[PDB]
């Protein structure tokens, strides 16, 4: 029986993880749920899943949650705040931690699961985008298993040989006959826009979808960040990474082997797939996802990314070579500039341009701990806000 | 250091295997080469690779080889005949047997490697098409490792989980999270021909790469035979097999999992890839095959086979359910009817129709040994010859 702590239970990943649990009650049991301020959805989850613990962001939410759980007869014990969330991530009889709290708030709880030697269903980009070296060192030192839940990394991982899958952070790609990792992305809505029109695209043209990630997919900042992550996670050099546009997103990513073989994972866009794969690894369970119907697909195509069309993708690649200050700064800047584009303060092409300008303006030492990473992030947001103000009168 | 016996060294699979050995001298050494009557090529192969043994079909061929090797100072000892080939397949210090002799002549030498507990690089169809129950029983008893060299099966194999790979025959697909095996094929040159034109196709049109295999691709007999083999090799029921047309042949075949994931192997058409995959398993070597270039591919498409277009594929699926007498008779009838079509004695559509007629005429007790299978084969060829003469005056 796998016992689970779900960090970020009330977002789509958390609900989807719960759907796997709901349909596999003989294999998984929820011990702890952690969320933010969504008391109502947390009530329903505690009543369906009977975890021992639930944690909210603050005392106000925790008190509401307590009152409502109590009204319904629940035995779930209610806590609040960051430490409590780290504590659930490290609980003694927990086997797996779904690490789905995103942003800076996901860093310490994910690191607490790692240092407790858990199996971490990794479902946030900040861990490896901002703290990849810190976190990969902690994984080695603490004997944690990372299992990537993100669609492209989960596909690479399914496509990697068993000795790498079980030894992330140590495994040598080359020694295991791996030539490169083929990280695929859709190329976004402006994949075929003449370059000259990029300057004038609007937030509606760039975006059912998720507006930030949607813009990140238009700039391919999203693949840029996936590139930074994959290199830490899979221990890949620059020459062991290829980024390929694949507009249909049926192939989720691939791995190229020494004999010419390429292994690929394919599927529906439903996150229950990669989530169930990690929960059940090295075995499988039913996820509720429809079997992929190959007779109803668009033709599958591929093309090389053009860095004049996708300067963010190139910027992410160069930031990796500059270290975790640089990838942390790029990520934070990009949150500010995308937000500005979406609020109609700057042009679409000013995302990449101001992302570049913010990195050019910083000169930060390599972070040595999480606090350092938060300090780079805070600083880069400030440099970014000011650049936005320079353009947005 | 892996020591090899190559059964069928002078054909294309044999030459390709030697190309892999040639570029990996630190990993593979040839102990024995077995060929038929091609003395000239066997000389060059013995001279380059210094095997301990060379076996030819007969004493006349063996005497020529011995004279020619003597004149070049070779120490290779020369043998002849079917028993010597079985003895090469069973040698104490051989690890791997490339089983590339095709037809009936390949049955006893493959079975010898299997009864000897060897790693078998399985490169002939008649083994599992005609003797699948016999050979998978002998595999269970000796714990021989089968590694399929044929492109589709090799892809399936690479796409299956590790506990299945390491125990074919005992493996339970369902228990390992596998929903089904996705066997792909091109659909042949008449994939889009109007149905009523089929009756009048000529041999040159069917042969857009042997003429027989070409015709087999056109009728999808080839995929039918592969379907029969895959069921034996992977212990798959009818409901665990799907057959999919994929006209570009870039995907080599796939495996569908319980969580909705599909794993696939892709590559160049070059047989050094699956050969090198089996020789190196569970590691990898360089095979000389260049990396697959995703920016130079046709759009990848898929469609369901239509049994009115391809009645041989349905015949093979049905013959499977009727047992090894049926699949043996089918394969044998097909050698005859295809040869008749190529020699302009029957029409293209008469291949499927006479293949059916031969199976209808046979009253077929289950083979209990290789001699039983050979007797079904011989009798089905006679029934098929007579049916051809019914049509071909
Ligand atoms: C789901 N996921 O992991 C993502 O990274 C989403 C954005 C990506 C994406 C876009 C369109 C799709 F149709 C799809 F499926 C995935 P991209 O970065 O453009 O490849
Ligand atoms: C390579 N191989 O194993 C074969 O069995 C050859 C015939 C097959 C085939 C046909 C055309 C191609 F272009 C190709 F690449 C492979 P099919 O049965 O039609 O899928
Ligand atoms: Mn992703
Ligand atoms: Mn084949």
mmCIF file of N, CA, C and O in Angstrom, chain A residues 158 162 177 182 244 254 256-259 261-266 273 276-277 284-287 289 291-292 294-295 299-304, chain B residues 158 162 177 182 244 254 256-259 261-266 273 276-277 284-287 289 291-292 294-295 297 299-300 302-304:
data_model
loop_
_atom_site.group_PDB
_atom_site.id
_atom_site.type_symbol
_atom_site.label_atom_id
_atom_site.label_comp_id
_atom_site.label_asym_id
_atom_site.label_seq_id
_atom_site.Cartn_x
_atom_site.Cartn_y
_atom_site.Cartn_z
ATOM 1 N N UNK A 158 10.146 7.577 -19.131
ATOM 2 C CA UNK A 158 9.613 6.267 -19.569
ATOM 3 C C UNK A 158 10.492 5.693 -20.702
ATOM 4 O O UNK A 158 10.490 4.493 -20.944
ATOM 5 N N UNK A 162 16.107 1.263 -17.600
ATOM 6 C CA UNK A 162 15.898 0.992 -16.199
ATOM 7 C C UNK A 162 17.014 1.417 -15.260
ATOM 8 O O UNK A 162 16.700 2.023 -14.225
ATOM 9 N N UNK A 177 24.237 3.964 -23.044
ATOM 10 C CA UNK A 177 23.964 3.848 -24.470
ATOM 11 C C UNK A 177 23.007 4.925 -24.943
ATOM 12 O O UNK A 177 22.382 4.825 -26.037
ATOM 13 N N UNK A 182 15.460 13.977 -26.557
ATOM 14 C CA UNK A 182 14.764 14.700 -27.587
ATOM 15 C C UNK A 182 13.547 15.302 -26.903
ATOM 16 O O UNK A 182 12.544 14.636 -26.689
ATOM 17 N N UNK A 244 12.956 19.743 -30.239
ATOM 18 C CA UNK A 244 12.315 19.490 -31.524
ATOM 19 C C UNK A 244 10.909 20.044 -31.452
ATOM 20 O O UNK A 244 10.228 19.812 -30.461
ATOM 21 N N UNK A 254 11.271 12.080 -26.403
ATOM 22 C CA UNK A 254 11.927 10.849 -26.888
ATOM 23 C C UNK A 254 13.363 10.743 -26.399
ATOM 24 O O UNK A 254 13.958 11.703 -25.852
ATOM 25 N N UNK A 256 17.222 9.058 -27.760
ATOM 26 C CA UNK A 256 17.962 8.560 -28.907
ATOM 27 C C UNK A 256 19.071 7.686 -28.385
ATOM 28 O O UNK A 256 19.738 8.032 -27.385
ATOM 29 N N UNK A 257 19.211 6.473 -28.941
ATOM 30 C CA UNK A 257 20.188 5.515 -28.443
ATOM 31 C C UNK A 257 21.339 5.300 -29.410
ATOM 32 O O UNK A 257 21.269 5.645 -30.600
ATOM 33 N N UNK A 258 22.368 4.668 -28.899
ATOM 34 C CA UNK A 258 23.675 4.576 -29.592
ATOM 35 C C UNK A 258 23.574 3.753 -30.882
ATOM 36 O O UNK A 258 24.347 3.952 -31.816
ATOM 37 N N UNK A 259 22.613 2.832 -30.950
ATOM 38 C CA UNK A 259 22.494 1.942 -32.097
ATOM 39 C C UNK A 259 21.575 2.543 -33.203
ATOM 40 O O UNK A 259 21.390 1.937 -34.278
ATOM 41 N N UNK A 261 18.337 3.448 -32.500
ATOM 42 C CA UNK A 261 16.990 3.430 -31.925
ATOM 43 C C UNK A 261 16.596 4.705 -31.247
ATOM 44 O O UNK A 261 17.380 5.335 -30.517
ATOM 45 N N UNK A 262 15.328 5.042 -31.401
ATOM 46 C CA UNK A 262 14.749 6.146 -30.679
ATOM 47 C C UNK A 262 13.542 5.591 -29.945
ATOM 48 O O UNK A 262 12.659 4.951 -30.559
ATOM 49 N N UNK A 263 13.458 5.849 -28.659
ATOM 50 C CA UNK A 263 12.262 5.407 -27.931
ATOM 51 C C UNK A 263 11.461 6.648 -27.627
ATOM 52 O O UNK A 263 12.051 7.708 -27.301
ATOM 53 N N UNK A 264 10.145 6.545 -27.801
ATOM 54 C CA UNK A 264 9.241 7.653 -27.591
ATOM 55 C C UNK A 264 8.111 7.243 -26.657
ATOM 56 O O UNK A 264 7.627 6.069 -26.714
ATOM 57 N N UNK A 265 7.615 8.179 -25.841
ATOM 58 C CA UNK A 265 6.308 7.953 -25.189
ATOM 59 C C UNK A 265 5.213 8.807 -25.885
ATOM 60 O O UNK A 265 5.411 9.981 -26.124
ATOM 61 N N UNK A 266 4.062 8.218 -26.171
ATOM 62 C CA UNK A 266 2.930 8.957 -26.750
ATOM 63 C C UNK A 266 1.685 8.851 -25.890
ATOM 64 O O UNK A 266 1.494 7.908 -25.106
ATOM 65 N N UNK A 273 -2.276 10.359 -16.958
ATOM 66 C CA UNK A 273 -1.337 9.392 -17.469
ATOM 67 C C UNK A 273 0.028 9.449 -16.795
ATOM 68 O O UNK A 273 0.417 8.472 -16.179
ATOM 69 N N UNK A 276 -0.224 8.789 -12.984
ATOM 70 C CA UNK A 276 -0.361 7.359 -12.589
ATOM 71 C C UNK A 276 0.900 6.588 -12.861
ATOM 72 O O UNK A 276 1.265 5.661 -12.150
ATOM 73 N N UNK A 277 1.565 6.924 -13.968
ATOM 74 C CA UNK A 277 2.830 6.233 -14.206
ATOM 75 C C UNK A 277 3.782 6.414 -13.007
ATOM 76 O O UNK A 277 4.457 5.453 -12.606
ATOM 77 N N UNK A 284 2.277 -0.488 -13.229
ATOM 78 C CA UNK A 284 1.271 0.389 -13.871
ATOM 79 C C UNK A 284 -0.072 0.266 -13.203
ATOM 80 O O UNK A 284 -0.430 -0.811 -12.695
ATOM 81 N N UNK A 285 -0.860 1.329 -13.219
ATOM 82 C CA UNK A 285 -2.281 1.110 -12.892
ATOM 83 C C UNK A 285 -3.153 1.758 -13.943
ATOM 84 O O UNK A 285 -2.719 2.596 -14.739
ATOM 85 N N UNK A 286 -4.406 1.421 -13.918
ATOM 86 C CA UNK A 286 -5.393 2.186 -14.632
ATOM 87 C C UNK A 286 -5.473 3.644 -14.150
ATOM 88 O O UNK A 286 -5.492 3.922 -12.933
ATOM 89 N N UNK A 287 -5.541 4.569 -15.094
ATOM 90 C CA UNK A 287 -5.553 6.017 -14.777
ATOM 91 C C UNK A 287 -6.916 6.649 -15.143
ATOM 92 O O UNK A 287 -7.116 7.851 -14.906
ATOM 93 N N UNK A 289 -7.715 7.221 -18.219
ATOM 94 C CA UNK A 289 -7.451 7.962 -19.463
ATOM 95 C C UNK A 289 -7.879 7.102 -20.666
ATOM 96 O O UNK A 289 -7.652 5.907 -20.708
ATOM 97 N N UNK A 291 -7.642 5.135 -24.032
ATOM 98 C CA UNK A 291 -6.580 4.646 -24.968
ATOM 99 C C UNK A 291 -6.441 5.523 -26.227
ATOM 100 O O UNK A 291 -7.416 5.984 -26.801
ATOM 101 N N UNK A 292 -5.212 5.851 -26.589
ATOM 102 C CA UNK A 292 -4.957 6.775 -27.671
ATOM 103 C C UNK A 292 -5.454 6.104 -28.968
ATOM 104 O O UNK A 292 -5.115 4.957 -29.257
ATOM 105 N N UNK A 294 -5.103 5.810 -32.604
ATOM 106 C CA UNK A 294 -4.214 6.202 -33.695
ATOM 107 C C UNK A 294 -4.973 6.468 -34.992
ATOM 108 O O UNK A 294 -4.435 7.122 -35.851
ATOM 109 N N UNK A 295 -6.208 5.971 -35.152
ATOM 110 C CA UNK A 295 -6.927 6.267 -36.413
ATOM 111 C C UNK A 295 -7.565 7.665 -36.418
ATOM 112 O O UNK A 295 -8.224 8.030 -37.374
ATOM 113 N N UNK A 299 -1.707 14.203 -38.852
ATOM 114 C CA UNK A 299 -0.451 13.681 -39.297
ATOM 115 C C UNK A 299 0.632 14.200 -38.320
ATOM 116 O O UNK A 299 0.611 15.380 -37.923
ATOM 117 N N UNK A 300 1.593 13.341 -37.925
ATOM 118 C CA UNK A 300 2.641 13.818 -36.987
ATOM 119 C C UNK A 300 3.826 14.444 -37.737
ATOM 120 O O UNK A 300 4.410 13.808 -38.639
ATOM 121 N N UNK A 301 4.219 15.655 -37.324
ATOM 122 C CA UNK A 301 5.290 16.360 -38.006
ATOM 123 C C UNK A 301 6.320 16.898 -36.983
ATOM 124 O O UNK A 301 6.061 16.891 -35.789
ATOM 125 N N UNK A 302 7.487 17.328 -37.471
ATOM 126 C CA UNK A 302 8.610 17.765 -36.650
ATOM 127 C C UNK A 302 9.318 18.876 -37.386
ATOM 128 O O UNK A 302 9.305 18.933 -38.647
ATOM 129 N N UNK A 303 9.937 19.758 -36.649
ATOM 130 C CA UNK A 303 10.741 20.774 -37.315
ATOM 131 C C UNK A 303 11.739 21.315 -36.287
ATOM 132 O O UNK A 303 11.537 21.125 -35.061
ATOM 133 N N UNK A 304 12.789 21.970 -36.758
ATOM 134 C CA UNK A 304 13.812 22.537 -35.865
ATOM 135 C C UNK A 304 13.361 23.894 -35.366
ATOM 136 O O UNK A 304 12.885 24.698 -36.139
ATOM 137 N N UNK B 158 11.729 -3.651 -27.385
ATOM 138 C CA UNK B 158 12.316 -2.439 -26.758
ATOM 139 C C UNK B 158 11.274 -1.607 -26.003
ATOM 140 O O UNK B 158 11.605 -0.826 -25.113
ATOM 141 N N UNK B 162 10.916 -4.172 -18.548
ATOM 142 C CA UNK B 162 11.992 -5.022 -18.263
ATOM 143 C C UNK B 162 11.656 -6.427 -17.707
ATOM 144 O O UNK B 162 12.282 -7.394 -18.174
ATOM 145 N N UNK B 177 1.163 -4.496 -16.649
ATOM 146 C CA UNK B 177 0.628 -3.185 -16.975
ATOM 147 C C UNK B 177 0.433 -2.958 -18.476
ATOM 148 O O UNK B 177 0.101 -1.853 -18.920
ATOM 149 N N UNK B 182 1.062 -3.156 -30.355
ATOM 150 C CA UNK B 182 0.609 -2.404 -31.499
ATOM 151 C C UNK B 182 1.552 -2.751 -32.610
ATOM 152 O O UNK B 182 2.678 -2.233 -32.690
ATOM 153 N N UNK B 244 -1.925 -2.142 -37.012
ATOM 154 C CA UNK B 244 -2.115 -0.776 -37.445
ATOM 155 C C UNK B 244 -1.339 -0.496 -38.715
ATOM 156 O O UNK B 244 -0.142 -0.787 -38.761
ATOM 157 N N UNK B 254 4.737 -0.584 -31.385
ATOM 158 C CA UNK B 254 4.467 0.119 -30.163
ATOM 159 C C UNK B 254 3.846 -0.797 -29.091
ATOM 160 O O UNK B 254 3.405 -1.926 -29.403
ATOM 161 N N UNK B 256 0.988 -0.519 -25.784
ATOM 162 C CA UNK B 256 0.042 0.307 -25.080
ATOM 163 C C UNK B 256 -0.045 -0.171 -23.612
ATOM 164 O O UNK B 256 -0.153 -1.392 -23.323
ATOM 165 N N UNK B 257 0.037 0.785 -22.690
ATOM 166 C CA UNK B 257 -0.012 0.543 -21.268
ATOM 167 C C UNK B 257 -1.310 0.940 -20.570
ATOM 168 O O UNK B 257 -2.069 1.782 -21.043
ATOM 169 N N UNK B 258 -1.473 0.426 -19.374
ATOM 170 C CA UNK B 258 -2.757 0.529 -18.609
ATOM 171 C C UNK B 258 -3.059 1.977 -18.230
ATOM 172 O O UNK B 258 -4.211 2.357 -18.023
ATOM 173 N N UNK B 259 -2.004 2.777 -18.058
ATOM 174 C CA UNK B 259 -2.233 4.208 -17.690
ATOM 175 C C UNK B 259 -2.564 5.122 -18.900
ATOM 176 O O UNK B 259 -2.837 6.353 -18.746
ATOM 177 N N UNK B 261 -0.336 5.477 -21.468
ATOM 178 C CA UNK B 261 0.955 5.576 -22.197
ATOM 179 C C UNK B 261 1.103 4.586 -23.317
ATOM 180 O O UNK B 261 0.761 3.378 -23.194
ATOM 181 N N UNK B 262 1.650 5.075 -24.422
ATOM 182 C CA UNK B 262 2.097 4.188 -25.494
ATOM 183 C C UNK B 262 3.607 4.365 -25.650
ATOM 184 O O UNK B 262 4.101 5.522 -25.776
ATOM 185 N N UNK B 263 4.335 3.275 -25.636
ATOM 186 C CA UNK B 263 5.781 3.369 -25.916
ATOM 187 C C UNK B 263 6.012 2.888 -27.295
ATOM 188 O O UNK B 263 5.388 1.873 -27.706
ATOM 189 N N UNK B 264 6.919 3.557 -28.009
ATOM 190 C CA UNK B 264 7.179 3.199 -29.393
ATOM 191 C C UNK B 264 8.698 3.199 -29.624
ATOM 192 O O UNK B 264 9.426 3.984 -28.986
ATOM 193 N N UNK B 265 9.162 2.391 -30.586
ATOM 194 C CA UNK B 265 10.541 2.492 -31.091
ATOM 195 C C UNK B 265 10.512 3.038 -32.544
ATOM 196 O O UNK B 265 9.723 2.591 -33.385
ATOM 197 N N UNK B 266 11.370 4.001 -32.822
ATOM 198 C CA UNK B 266 11.469 4.544 -34.185
ATOM 199 C C UNK B 266 12.923 4.441 -34.660
ATOM 200 O O UNK B 266 13.864 4.329 -33.853
ATOM 201 N N UNK B 273 20.531 -1.656 -36.693
ATOM 202 C CA UNK B 273 19.978 -1.164 -35.437
ATOM 203 C C UNK B 273 19.376 -2.283 -34.519
ATOM 204 O O UNK B 273 19.827 -2.415 -33.376
ATOM 205 N N UNK B 276 22.097 -4.833 -33.557
ATOM 206 C CA UNK B 276 23.021 -4.324 -32.474
ATOM 207 C C UNK B 276 22.261 -4.224 -31.137
ATOM 208 O O UNK B 276 22.799 -4.449 -30.060
ATOM 209 N N UNK B 277 20.974 -3.835 -31.201
ATOM 210 C CA UNK B 277 20.178 -3.842 -29.982
ATOM 211 C C UNK B 277 20.199 -5.271 -29.336
ATOM 212 O O UNK B 277 20.371 -5.415 -28.105
ATOM 213 N N UNK B 284 23.952 -1.104 -24.879
ATOM 214 C CA UNK B 284 23.895 -0.648 -26.298
ATOM 215 C C UNK B 284 25.270 -0.583 -26.895
ATOM 216 O O UNK B 284 26.251 -0.261 -26.188
ATOM 217 N N UNK B 285 25.359 -0.773 -28.203
ATOM 218 C CA UNK B 285 26.629 -0.404 -28.852
ATOM 219 C C UNK B 285 26.343 0.469 -30.056
ATOM 220 O O UNK B 285 25.203 0.537 -30.557
ATOM 221 N N UNK B 286 27.374 1.080 -30.563
ATOM 222 C CA UNK B 286 27.255 1.752 -31.847
ATOM 223 C C UNK B 286 27.042 0.727 -32.940
ATOM 224 O O UNK B 286 27.714 -0.308 -32.956
ATOM 225 N N UNK B 287 26.116 0.969 -33.848
ATOM 226 C CA UNK B 287 25.839 0.017 -34.937
ATOM 227 C C UNK B 287 26.273 0.548 -36.298
ATOM 228 O O UNK B 287 26.031 -0.142 -37.267
ATOM 229 N N UNK B 289 24.729 3.014 -37.676
ATOM 230 C CA UNK B 289 23.535 3.582 -38.269
ATOM 231 C C UNK B 289 23.520 5.072 -37.840
ATOM 232 O O UNK B 289 23.703 5.397 -36.669
ATOM 233 N N UNK B 291 22.026 8.750 -36.796
ATOM 234 C CA UNK B 291 20.822 9.140 -36.057
ATOM 235 C C UNK B 291 19.661 9.536 -36.987
ATOM 236 O O UNK B 291 19.853 10.109 -38.068
ATOM 237 N N UNK B 292 18.453 9.157 -36.577
ATOM 238 C CA UNK B 292 17.221 9.422 -37.326
ATOM 239 C C UNK B 292 17.009 10.930 -37.374
ATOM 240 O O UNK B 292 17.041 11.630 -36.347
ATOM 241 N N UNK B 294 14.688 13.771 -37.570
ATOM 242 C CA UNK B 294 13.258 14.114 -37.515
ATOM 243 C C UNK B 294 12.889 15.291 -38.404
ATOM 244 O O UNK B 294 11.704 15.459 -38.718
ATOM 245 N N UNK B 295 13.859 16.128 -38.802
ATOM 246 C CA UNK B 295 13.471 17.220 -39.749
ATOM 247 C C UNK B 295 13.359 16.819 -41.226
ATOM 248 O O UNK B 295 13.076 17.651 -42.060
ATOM 249 N N UNK B 297 11.522 13.879 -42.331
ATOM 250 C CA UNK B 297 10.620 12.729 -42.360
ATOM 251 C C UNK B 297 9.372 13.139 -43.119
ATOM 252 O O UNK B 297 9.049 14.339 -43.149
ATOM 253 N N UNK B 299 5.226 13.195 -43.018
ATOM 254 C CA UNK B 299 4.242 13.272 -41.968
ATOM 255 C C UNK B 299 3.855 11.808 -41.566
ATOM 256 O O UNK B 299 3.624 10.953 -42.437
ATOM 257 N N UNK B 300 3.793 11.514 -40.269
ATOM 258 C CA UNK B 300 3.505 10.135 -39.835
ATOM 259 C C UNK B 300 1.977 9.944 -39.744
ATOM 260 O O UNK B 300 1.292 10.724 -39.056
ATOM 261 N N UNK B 302 -1.503 6.937 -39.669
ATOM 262 C CA UNK B 302 -1.936 5.639 -39.230
ATOM 263 C C UNK B 302 -3.358 5.364 -39.806
ATOM 264 O O UNK B 302 -4.090 6.311 -40.064
ATOM 265 N N UNK B 303 -3.738 4.091 -39.992
ATOM 266 C CA UNK B 303 -5.122 3.727 -40.398
ATOM 267 C C UNK B 303 -5.353 2.264 -39.996
ATOM 268 O O UNK B 303 -4.387 1.526 -39.785
ATOM 269 N N UNK B 304 -6.598 1.846 -39.874
ATOM 270 C CA UNK B 304 -6.926 0.475 -39.500
ATOM 271 C C UNK B 304 -6.875 -0.381 -40.757
ATOM 272 O O UNK B 304 -7.375 0.038 -41.770
#
